[PDB]
Paper text:
In fact, the G15S, K90R, and P132H mutations are located far from the PF-00835231 binding pocket.
M pro is able to process polyproteins to produce several nonstructural proteins (NSPs) necessary for viral replication. PF-00835231 is an inhibitor designed for the main protease of SARS-CoV that emerged in 2003, but its clinical trials were suspended due to the rapid disappearance of the SARS outbreak.
Author numbering:
A (entry chain A), B (entry chain B): 3 to 301
Write the structure that this text describes.
Amino acid sequence: FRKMAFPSGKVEGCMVQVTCGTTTLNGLWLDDVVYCPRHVICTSEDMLNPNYEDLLIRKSNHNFLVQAGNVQLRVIGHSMQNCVLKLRVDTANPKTPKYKFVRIQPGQTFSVLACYNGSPSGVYQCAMRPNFTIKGSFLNGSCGSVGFNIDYDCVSFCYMHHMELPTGVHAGTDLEGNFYGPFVDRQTAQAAGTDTTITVNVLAWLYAAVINGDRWFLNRFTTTLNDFNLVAMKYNYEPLTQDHVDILGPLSAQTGIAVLDMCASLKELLQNGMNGRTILGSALLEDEFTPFDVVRQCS
Amino acid sequence: FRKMAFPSGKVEGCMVQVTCGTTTLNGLWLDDVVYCPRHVICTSEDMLNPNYEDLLIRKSNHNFLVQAGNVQLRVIGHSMQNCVLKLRVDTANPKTPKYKFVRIQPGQTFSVLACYNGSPSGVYQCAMRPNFTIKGSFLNGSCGSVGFNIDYDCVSFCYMHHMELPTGVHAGTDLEGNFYGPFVDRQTAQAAGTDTTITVNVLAWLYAAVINGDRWFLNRFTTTLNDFNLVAMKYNYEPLTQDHVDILGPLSAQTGIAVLDMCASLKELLQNGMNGRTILGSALLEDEFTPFDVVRQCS
Ligand SMILES: *[C@@](O)(CO)[C@H](C[C@@H]1CCNC1=O)NC(=O)[C@H](CC(C)C)NC(=O)c1cc2c(OC)cccc2[nH]1
Ligand SMILES: *[C@@](O)(CO)[C@H](C[C@@H]1CCNC1=O)NC(=O)[C@H](CC(C)C)NC(=O)c1cc2c(OC)cccc2[nH]1
């Protein structure tokens, strides 16, 4: 198994660049609106402690340079929604895919299309950590790059890139401008909360192992969900939600291993370790594959 | 620092479905030619030992059903180049990018666009192993998926997918239809030569780790090129040439770490193990980033 991104073409056709003064970043052109991080309106000095409502009043439509390639799109309106700017343009993007804006939960994976000056550069899979950071690869100029999943040609946009933490992980918003995690779009050193292991994804990994005949860790025990969650937290694992239990349903049906039976197997792994053995060839338990990712790659 | 694929949009617009009888796979549509694996002409019985020229002479243009999305393309002629079939169609692909066919060297990387029934499914980075396999993710119906690099809007196609070895690694051809490695397009269980580790890539990856702020594996020792190669060959690593040393020049200049100093670090990692520590999140030495991959991503 390996990290597989979605084909990026439907998103590539939506990337533009947005410039205010000398500040340039990326934007997302869907129908006749361009979405981008609101800090494009900031001068490099104003980012240190910005007042976005006051900064935005000083701006007019003609202050915004939106370019598809080197072709300018005329801006006819502007508004701010949380930390994203919405620029109405006079052309509906003919490459707009079927799309949705969704806000994901920790553990969910998505593809990131890293972009610079409106030009796509590369694509890779990320997982939203429980501390609401992602382990990306982003340089200067990457803000406004988006993350997405594609289901039956419908693109669900879930991430817009804003910041690199001092630890080198990355933080951002959904496409309604609401940050994931406790971060703010100011030029300031911010720290995420201590991270945890994504339990639902580790369980997905164990199901993947079972699907492939690697099942030594299956045990004779079961557990209640509450009992499991209390043990999980003492090993820095996330507690399971009812939604986690339900997204494991398909894999549980496919293998015949009840979710709570797999929880009891993981619990034993947590208290006694792998004892020198491997699962799917690895000595480490992987927590960046969702149940959907496993089904995607196994079936 | 992440395994990063090229944006796949320019290739997505070229993927089609090719069907001959009950056999279907993917094809690559460029200008007015569709390229696909020639075993699409084989029935299940033919595939055990196909005499391809004999089988192709018996097919007509209308035996080939080519579908692009929903629209059917009419085949107006066909020729065979080694293991690749070239179907001339009566419509030019309007989305054909600037492109080239290239045969890549062992150790080089490329992006794979995995496709099923002519529809792109996922994108990820692969390296051509020294034993001329690739460690990919391909399921039933993935034949004809292609591997590629992109440089300033020009797509260099280097791989077309044909088979999965019993070990789970993958084998295929260049776009001239010549296999990488000693493999043959027949339905038999085929073994590869013993694989070795791409030494220059491991070194590039260690430099990537240093550029990203990890230095724990460095040491105060040096080695000569030949003494390093002696230990490298002992551990089934490929020899490091003076060309490799020169290619690593920029990464050494960026970090101020002499190439042979980093060879001494790798020598220690090989002789001492990693001791449960990790480099860029990996518990194993990674050899599928080239020096260019590191430079392109880190800057
Ligand atoms: C954008 O592209 C801005 O348009 C940029 C993306 C990062 C640059 C390097 N890698 C990236 O991911 N984002 C920023 O520069 C943001 C801008 C804010 C949200 C207005 N700032 C940071 O990410 C940032 C600031 C500071 C900092 O200060 C002082 C100290 C430490 C870390 C840090 N990150
Ligand atoms: C294609 O898609 C065929 O159109 C298919 C791709 C593989 C299927 C599973 N994963 C893949 O990557 N390729 C094949 O099925 C090829 C067909 C050849 C080129 C005619 N065959 C194999 O990959 C193959 C055959 C055998 C085998 O026999 C007997 C025994 C063991 C392994 C094996 N692999």
